[PDB]
Paper text:
PP1 is directed to its different pathway-specific substrates by scaffold proteins; PPP1R3 are those orienting PP1 towards GYSs and PYGs.
We determined the crystal structure of the PTG CBM21 in complex with β-cyclodextrin in two different space groups at 1.5 and 2.0 Å resolution. The domain is organized in a β-sandwich of eight antiparallel strands (β2-β9) divided into two β-sheets, with an overall immunoglobulin-like fold. The four chains (one in the orthorhombic crystal and three in the asymmetric unit of the monoclinic system) are identical with an average rmsd of 0.36 Å (over Cα atoms). In site I, half of the cyclodextrin molecule lies on the shallow tray generated by the β4-β5-β8-β9 sheet together with the β4-β5 and the β9-β10 loops. At site II, the cyclic oligosaccharide inserts in between the β3-β4 and the β6-β7 loops with a close net of H-bonds connecting it to PTG residues Asn177, Phe180, Glu181, Lys182, Asp214, and Tyr203 (this last being water-mediated); additionally, extensive van der Waals contacts are present with Lys182, Tyr203 and especially Phe180 that, inserting in the cyclodextrin ring, becomes fully buried. The observed interaction at site I configures then as a crystallographic interface or as an ancillary carbohydrate-interacting site, which binding to glucose chains is cooperatively reinforced by the dominant interaction at site II; while site I shows some sequence divergence, all site II residues are conserved in PTG, GM and GL. The PTG CBM21 structure is similar to GL with significant deviations for β6-β7 (5.4 Å distance between PTG-Y208 Cα atom and the corresponding GL-Y184) and β9-β10 loops, other than for N- and C-termini, and minor divergences for the β7-β8 loop and the helical region.
Author numbering: 133 to 261
């Protein structure tokens, strides 16, 4: 009934790297299971202290929620970037007319960086299936 309306950003490496180098934050993977959306976010390692959040709407941006992401230790990651994970429960019912979208914010060293997917956000759409 719901599906991701975007390719996994990490699949197209050249696009992923271009966005990540420009914005210093980029969604890496995302999956929709049951009524929960989970995923991973790559951020440039700008400073020790970081705050990474998903800003998500389930009602066409009438409202939104900021959800904290959690740092993921990665033995195989480099020292230039860090990985954060998120898990967000969907509301029990979302009417078909309502848009579901999210974007990502990243605070470090007094600055804020955004992944808004080239101004479209990351969309989840309603389907017949
Ligand atoms: O321990 C040395 C450290 O002490 C002081 O730091 C204090 C700090 O100022 C307070 O803010 C508080 O910190 C808490 C913090 O506010 C919370 O947000 C949370 O921290 C989380 C981070 O926000 C989050 O980003 C993630 O952290 C991981 C990093 O993302 C990842 O990159 C890696 O971190 C490495 C750093 O990137 C790298 O720079 C290097 O860090 C050194 C610092 O650069 C250097 O300044 C100093 O740090 C001092 C600091 O200046 C003091 O203010 O030494 C660091 C090396 O020891 O190395 C890092 C890897 O070791 O990994 C981290 C995760 O380890 O997740 C964390 C949540 O775990 O919690 C913080 C409290 O735990 O208190 C601190 C502690 O005194």
């Amino acid at each position: 009934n719901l599906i991701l309306d975007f390719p996994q950003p990490s699949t197209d490496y050249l696009s992923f790297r271009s966005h990540f180098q420009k914005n210093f934050v980029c969604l890496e993977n995302c999956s929709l299971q049951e009524r929960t959306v989970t995923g991973t976010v790559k951020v440039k390692n700008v400073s020790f202290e970081k705050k990474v959040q998903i800003r998500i709407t389930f009602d066409s941006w009438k409202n939104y929620t900021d959800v904290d992401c959690v740092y993921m230790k990665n033995v195989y990651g480099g020292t230039d970037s860090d990985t954060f994970s998120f898990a967000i429960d969907l509301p029990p019912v979302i009417p078909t007319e309502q848009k579901i979208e999210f974007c990502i914010s990243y605070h470090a060293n007094g600055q804020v960086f955004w992944d808004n997917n080239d101004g479209q956000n990351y969309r989840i759409v309603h389907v017949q299936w």
